[PDB]
Design an enzyme around this catalytic site. Structure first.
Site, PDB file in Angstrom:
ATOM      1  N   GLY A  18     -20.330   9.605  -0.332  1.00  0.00           N
ATOM      2  CA  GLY A  18     -18.893   9.375  -0.273  1.00  0.00           C
ATOM      3  C   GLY A  18     -18.295   9.113   1.089  1.00  0.00           C
ATOM      4  O   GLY A  18     -18.748   9.650   2.105  1.00  0.00           O
ATOM      5  N   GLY A  20     -14.355   8.814   2.635  1.00  0.00           N
ATOM      6  CA  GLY A  20     -12.965   9.078   2.346  1.00  0.00           C
ATOM      7  C   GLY A  20     -12.238   8.868   3.642  1.00  0.00           C
ATOM      8  O   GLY A  20     -12.860   8.897   4.697  1.00  0.00           O
ATOM      9  N   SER A  22     -10.391  10.828   5.033  1.00  0.00           N
ATOM     10  CA  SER A  22     -10.642  12.088   5.704  1.00  0.00           C
ATOM     11  C   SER A  22     -11.800  12.864   5.075  1.00  0.00           C
ATOM     12  O   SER A  22     -12.108  13.964   5.509  1.00  0.00           O
ATOM     13  CB  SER A  22      -9.377  12.943   5.701  1.00  0.00           C
ATOM     14  N   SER A  23     -12.440  12.303   4.055  1.00  0.00           N
ATOM     15  CA  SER A  23     -13.521  13.021   3.381  1.00  0.00           C
ATOM     16  C   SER A  23     -14.838  12.289   3.218  1.00  0.00           C
ATOM     17  O   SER A  23     -14.887  11.074   3.127  1.00  0.00           O
ATOM     18  CB  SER A  23     -13.051  13.505   2.012  1.00  0.00           C
ATOM     19  OG  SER A  23     -12.355  12.487   1.331  1.00  0.00           O
ATOM     20  N   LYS A  24     -15.905  13.067   3.186  1.00  0.00           N
ATOM     21  CA  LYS A  24     -17.241  12.549   3.029  1.00  0.00           C
ATOM     22  C   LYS A  24     -18.021  13.405   2.040  1.00  0.00           C
ATOM     23  O   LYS A  24     -17.791  14.596   1.934  1.00  0.00           O
ATOM     24  CB  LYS A  24     -17.949  12.538   4.376  1.00  0.00           C
ATOM     25  CG  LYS A  24     -17.230  11.745   5.448  1.00  0.00           C
ATOM     26  N   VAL A  25     -18.948  12.786   1.323  1.00  0.00           N
ATOM     27  CA  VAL A  25     -19.787  13.496   0.351  1.00  0.00           C
ATOM     28  C   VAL A  25     -21.244  13.389   0.793  1.00  0.00           C
ATOM     29  O   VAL A  25     -21.736  12.291   1.022  1.00  0.00           O
ATOM     30  CB  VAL A  25     -19.601  13.025  -1.115  1.00  0.00           C
ATOM     31  CG1 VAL A  25     -20.375  13.919  -2.081  1.00  0.00           C
ATOM     32  CG2 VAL A  25     -18.126  12.964  -1.500  1.00  0.00           C
ATOM     33  N   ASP A 133      -3.718  10.161 -13.230  1.00  0.00           N
ATOM     34  CA  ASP A 133      -4.418   9.112 -12.496  1.00  0.00           C
ATOM     35  C   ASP A 133      -5.842   8.910 -12.987  1.00  0.00           C
ATOM     36  O   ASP A 133      -6.720   8.567 -12.201  1.00  0.00           O
ATOM     37  CB  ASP A 133      -4.425   9.433 -11.001  1.00  0.00           C
ATOM     38  CG  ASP A 133      -4.642   8.206 -10.139  1.00  0.00           C
ATOM     39  OD1 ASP A 133      -4.143   7.122 -10.506  1.00  0.00           O
ATOM     40  OD2 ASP A 133      -5.303   8.325  -9.089  1.00  0.00           O
TER      41      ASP A 133
END
Ligand SMILES: Cc1ccc(-n2nc(C(C)(C)C)cc2NC(N)=O)cc1
EC number: 2.7.12.1
Length: 258
Positions: A18, A20, A22-25, A133
């Protein structure tokens, strides 16, 4: 070859799945070699409204664990003013990336995935949460099962799954809004496209969804029950649209071999 600590335990990173703003996976392995997915949220630049949303999303994620196995697992987490680490169960592929690859969907597989979406969404409604959503991306395939990864509380994108009552609204949002989006995912899983996919002008799309005169096409298919489900989920009047509880009792899910 990196590594990371979450509540004492150390996890070794294999790969990133991922991205993002501000985000990562990260696909990670624990000490015993077990596989997990860690979501790293960077909080260095976030406002109070945004924080409180992430705090709320996490709280609900933790509370609804016991209620259903159709919701992604949240084994542990580390929260600080700088970052959030979430140890969560690993999946094979998200439903959106699977639909873009898999050309012909098996009717048994479609029905099994649909029941899963219904059980997960139904559970959140019981707790008073409306995703508002819903999209394929929100669902992860784990062990040949579909799990809901987020609740829509915490923060290119598409208007394909948007219900007519959201557009006409311009709180006017109810559980039925999630039924429309689930109907759009199922219509995609059935006819290989979203109900309004063909309309390129984004403004024209929004008008079509909200237009009573525009008729959504339901081409004749061998599964007569499936056709009814789609026609009932994609009803423009949310008051006339079918409910999740009713959908559960529909022949399409309950009956075997149609
Ligand atoms: C496009 C995309 C990429 C990765 C994911 N994703 N998200 C997760 C969390 C459990 C951390 C939420 C896991 C995965 N993907 C995966 N293969 O497990 C979901 C969607």
């Amino acid at each position: 070859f990196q590594s990371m600590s979450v509540k004492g335990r150390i996890y070794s990173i294999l790969k990133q799945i991922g991205s993002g703003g501000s985000s990562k996976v990260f696909q990670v392995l624990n000490e015993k070699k077990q596989i997990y997915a860690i979501k790293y949220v960077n909080l260095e630049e976030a406002d109070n409204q945004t924080l409180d949303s992430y705090r709320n999303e996490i709280a609900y994620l933790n509370k609804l664990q016991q209620h259903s196995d159709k919701i992604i697992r949240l084994y542990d987490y580390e929260i600080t003013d700088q970052y959030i680490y979430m140890v969560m169960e690993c999946g094979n592929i998200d439903l959106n990336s699977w639909l873009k690859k898999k050309k012909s969907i098996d009717p048994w597989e479609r029905k099994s995935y649909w029941k899963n979406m219904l059980e997960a969404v139904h559970t959140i409604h019981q707790h008073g949460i409306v995703h508002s959503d819903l999209k394929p991306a929100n669902f992860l395939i784990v062990d040949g099962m579909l799990k809901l990864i987020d609740f829509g509380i915490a923060n290119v994108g598409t208007v394909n799954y948007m219900p007519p009552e959201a557009i006409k609204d311009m709180s006017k949002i109810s559980p039925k809004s999630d039924v429309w989006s689930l109907g759009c995912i199922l219509y995609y899983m059935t006819y290989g496209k979203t109900p309004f996919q063909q309309i390129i002008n984004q403004i024209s799309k929004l008008h079509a969804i909200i237009d009573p005169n525009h008729e959504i096409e339901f081409p004749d298919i061998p599964e007569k029950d499936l056709q009814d489900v789609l026609k009932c989920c994609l009803k423009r009047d949310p008051k006339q649209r079918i409910s999740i509880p009713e959908l559960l009792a529909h022949p399409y899910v309950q009956i075997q071999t149609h």
